[PDB]
Design a protein around this ligand. Structure first.
Ligand SMILES: [Zn+2]
Ligand SMILES: [Zn+2]
Lengths: 183, 181
């Protein structure tokens, strides 16, 4: 099922994955399939006086490389050999060909800052996103399963049916998929 | 000449300005007219063992808006009034309607991280960008004229002849267009 595709270190994007991108007002791009769900989400947040942005939508391989390299540079500057920096940067940034952002199913949502702080948007999304098919992909209690640190901006479209189950079930996507495969 | 357009609070982007955009491999977009020059710039950089990336090309009004609001929020959070936060934010980020990035003639160039540092790239661009017809639009010593802070990553396409002149004359774009008079 298309919305449940697993992309992680162990599950790279399939060769020749087709994606039709819609362009948002801010120039970011998303899978046309998630557009009205994301639109509903933003509509709802604003109706609650919460004002989010799409910081990052679709990213190309090259784009994913540059974010990753910038992340590595940051850790080198904090006293990491480049070998240490790579491994450490990879807990924040997926190596190219393993970011969900390469599907067009992930958005990194932030506050517009002026009407809302990061924390208010992050809270709101955590409690609400599932109603619109989006999950908090990388919660702090599952970093030992996802391989990724607490990333309160990164929301993954999986669809309403699945997001609600995952949210109630209190699980990460890997667990949910693993538990679906078992039964 | 089309490439010398000045753009600021006084000179908002013209109504229906015509951008003719191209996607780069990182997903950033540039006016197609600057494509060969940017490619020549990265080629020469890479040839010099210097490894730049385009962190930002074309931006929508809304994209510009979002950067500016994020900047304003950073200043509000460090105790600036709404009016100060905006004032301060504007020295780093142009207001929508006044950015060169909305022309697709401006690129933010950073280091690729692991082959070069930002300063090495910033240094290189400083000394070589004009050959490809880009200028360091916002030099430190012209913040009074340009109304923008030192932004060593921001390069404006103006053309090789144009960029070369401005660089030797040591001037900022505002200055050169007043030279023309
Ligand atoms: Zn993300
Ligand atoms: Zn810029």
């Amino acid at each position: 099922e298309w919305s449940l595709i697993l992309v992680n270190r162990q599950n790279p994007i399939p060769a020749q994955y087709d994606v039709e991108l819609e362009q948002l007002s801010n120039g970011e791009r998303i899978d046309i399939r998630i557009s009205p769900y994301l639109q509903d989400l933003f509509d709802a947040a604003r109706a609650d006086g919460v004002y989010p942005i799409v910081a990052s939508g679709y990213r190309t391989t090259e784009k994913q490389q540059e974010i990753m390299d910038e992340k590595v540079a940051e850790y080198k500057a904090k006293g990491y050999t480049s070998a240490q920096a790579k491994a450490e940067a990879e807990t924040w940034v997926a190596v190219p060909g393993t970011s969900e952002h390469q599907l067009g199913l992930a958005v990194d949502i932030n506050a517009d800052g002026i009407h809302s702080t990061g924390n208010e948007v992050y809270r709101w999304l955590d409690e609400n996103s599932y109603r619109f098919g989006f999950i908090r992909r990388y919660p702090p209690d599952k970093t030992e399963i996802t391989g990724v640190s607490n990333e309160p901006w990164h929301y993954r479209y999986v669809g309403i049916e699945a997001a609600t189950k995952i949210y109630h079930q209190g699980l990460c996507l890997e667990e949910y998929l693993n538990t679906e495969k078992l039964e």
